[PDB]
């Protein structure tokens, strides 16, 4: 918190906690299926899948591989987007909307491309 500020640190810690819980739940989901999780764990799993996808990004150096041009996301926008994600503000968008994009405008555009909003 001292160097990056309370908000950045808090959002990063929350993302890490959610992803760690998702890692812990992966084997259960593999065997017994998601439906045997508690409601809060199901919510966390959906959030974690979206978070892990949103951490991916279309990079400038990767266009030679994807054919997609890269993107750059400001730090403040990154913090705000992941703060919204950890609160479940985007839980209603398909997880495929979060894959290999930039900021929240890219997210909105891809979601509309996928029939969401």
């Amino acid at each position: 918190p001292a160097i990056v500020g309370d908000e950045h640190y808090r959002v990063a810690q929350e993302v890490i906690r959610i992803l760690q819980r998702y890692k812990d739940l992966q084997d259960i989901i593999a065997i017994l299926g998601i439906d045997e999780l508690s409601e809060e764990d199901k919510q966390l799993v959906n959030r974690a899948r979206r978070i892990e996808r949103f951490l991916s990004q279309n990079m400038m150096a990767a266009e030679q591989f994807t054919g997609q041009p890269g993107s750059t996301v400001p730090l403040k926008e990154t913090i705000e987007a992941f703060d919204k994600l950890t609160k479940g503000e985007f839980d209603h968008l398909p997880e495929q909307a979060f894959f290999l994009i930039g900021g929240l405008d890219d997210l909105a555009k891809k979601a509309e491309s996928l029939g969401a909003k």
């Binding site: 989901i29 593999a30 065997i31 017994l32 299926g33 998601i34 439906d35 899948r49 994807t66 054919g67 997609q68 495929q96 894959f99 290999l100």
Partner: peptide, 20 residues
């Protein structure tokens, strides 16, 4: 352009949604 990534994501989803 995106076939390999699409197939990787598909395999991930197929594993994840196996018992959904």
């Amino acid at each position: 352009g995106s076939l390999r990534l699409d197939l990787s994501q598909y395999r991930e989803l197929e594993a994840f949604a196996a018992f959904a």
